[PDB]
Curated annotation (Swiss-Prot):
It is found in: Nucleus, Nucleolus. The modification N6-acetyllysine is found at residue 89. This is Heterogeneous nuclear ribonucleoprotein M. Sumoylated. Identified in the spliceosome C complex. Interacts with PPIA/CYPA. The chain holds residues 196 to 296 of 730 of the full protein. Residues 16-93 form the RRM domain. The modification Phosphoserine is found at residue 16. There is a cross-link at residues 33, 89, 97 (Glycyl lysine isopeptide (Lys-Gly) (interchain with G-Cter in SUMO2)). The lineage of its organism: Eukaryota, Metazoa, Chordata, Craniata, Vertebrata. Pre-mRNA binding protein in vivo, binds avidly to poly(G) and poly(U) RNA homopolymers in vitro. Involved in splicing. Acts as a receptor for carcinoembryonic antigen in Kupffer cells, may initiate a series of signaling events leading to tyrosine phosphorylation of proteins and induction of IL-1 alpha, IL-6, IL-10 and tumor necrosis factor alpha cytokines. It comes from Homo sapiens (Human).
């Protein structure tokens, strides 16, 4: 069987979700969320765990509007929390919002007929 042909790329950095890494064990979804509350309202706040169960210093925060999300990422980008720098980067999976329509406008004109 073939090795394993793969393919991917990053074309469209959209969304609000933010990936947080290098967090303190003590830091819980509570504090994390409460903190991110600054940039804006956290629609969904939770922490990422591994097989063992203990958080690997990685969390996830979801704001309401992109604007708010961005602010946090920055205001938190390189922020020293509990004597430990946090890593807030824009999420990868940019899920849509069921909002998109094709360009359809009522325009008809062309008086030409032999």
């Amino acid at each position: 069987g073939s090795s394993g042909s793969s393919g991917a790329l990053q074309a469209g950095r959209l969304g609000s979700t933010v990936f947080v890494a290098n967090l303190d064990y003590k830091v819980g979804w509570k504090k994390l969320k409460e903190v991110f509350s600054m940039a804006g309202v956290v629609v969904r706040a939770d922490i990422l765990e591994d097989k063992d169960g203990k958080s690997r210093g990685i969390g996830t925060v979801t704001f309401e509007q992109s604007i708010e999300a961005v602010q946090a990422i920055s205001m938190f980008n390189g922020q020293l929390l509990f004597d430990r720098p946090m890593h807030v980067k824009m999420d990868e999976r940019a899920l849509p919002k069921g909002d998109f329509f094709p360009p359809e406008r009522p325009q008809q004109s062309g008086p030409s007929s032999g």
